């Protein structure tokens, strides 16, 4: 197992864990000091720690179900063996209170040195897809939970 | 080292974009270079060199003082074996519709000697871009960009 393969495996594992909906597995993949950065300035860009990530995912689960997250377009993946970083394109989908949701993402992971844990997460998503979901949720009185994390 | 040549290509990419020099922009690309915009709220059809030129000309007709620069340098991902680099960038411009600011993630596929760009993938804040399109449309200045961006 080269470093490149471990990083690719970590990215797929990251996505599968999220797809499975298992909160304990999510946190077990992260270092204690892991931070998540959402990188669309139309939404909050304040980094979230592991406890805040759990709370945010709970708000998601209140409004969505059948959540899936998977790597797409794998040939465009960028693997940095020296720095233990990987950038990959991903897609996600869910049924929600506001109707079907689909988004596409760019994720960067900072791995630990043995490539077993995630120490940093940067996410880009389509902000219009997300804002449209938030608008549909707000029309159904279901947006305040996600808004308290998402809004500027 | 391949690593510094990739990061150098990323810096040159942003410098040349910021200069607005279309000839220099095209000189940095292979003949077969494709540009992929990756926000599905906008067109995701790949653009070749000639289409990219026309697209940038449409930007120049509504905007000026365009800047494009690398940010958060420590977050870059440099893939020496595959000759790829992913980096965060920001951009700004003044426009007919008022000021524009966006933030981006760019992936470059370089040639084997790291001298040319052979593929570009870009993510941007689609709300920032849609808000600009709305402001342009309120000044009847959106038709050119919409023909490249919409759908």
Swiss-Prot record, chain A:
The UniProt record lists the keyword Isomerase: yes
InterPro entries according to UniProt: Fungal_Meroterpenoid_Isomerase
A GO term for molecular function: isomerase activity
UniProt entry keywords in alphabetical sequence: Isomerase
EC number: 5.-.-.-
Keyword Transmembrane: no
Coiled coil (UniProt feature): none
Any single biological process term in GO: paraherquonin biosynthetic process
Pathway: Secondary metabolite biosynthesis; terpenoid biosynthesis
The protein's assembly and partners: Homodimer.
Protein's job: Isomerase; part of the gene cluster that mediates the biosynthesis of paraherquonin, a meroterpenoid with a unique, highly congested hexacyclic molecular architecture. The first step of the pathway is the synthesis of 3,5-dimethylorsellinic acid (DMOA) by the polyketide synthase prhL.
Similarity remark: Belongs to the trt14 isomerase family.
The protein's name in its UniProt record: Isomerase prhC
Organism name: Penicillium brasilianum
The encoding gene: prhC
């Amino acid at each position: 197992n080269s470093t490149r393969e471990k990083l690719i495996a970590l990215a797929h594992k990251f996505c599968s864990i999220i797809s499975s909906g298992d909160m304990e597995a999510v946190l077990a993949l992260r270092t204690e000091s892991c931070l998540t950065y959402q990188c669309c300035p139309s939404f909050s860009t304040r980094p979230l720690n592991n406890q805040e990530t759990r709370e945010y995912f709970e708000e998601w689960k209140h409004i969505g179900w059948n959540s899936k997250f998977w790597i797409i377009d794998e040939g465009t993946m960028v693997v940095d063996e020296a720095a233990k970083k990987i950038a990959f394109r991903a897609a996600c989908s869910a049924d929600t209170i506001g109707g079907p949701y689909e988004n596409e993402n760019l994720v960067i992971l900072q791995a630990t040195d043995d490539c077993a844990l995630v120490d940093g997460i940067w996410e880009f998503f389509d902000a219009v897809r997300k804002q449209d979901l938030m608008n549909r949720l707000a029309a159904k009185q279901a947006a305040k939970g996600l808004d308290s994390w998402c809004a500027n």
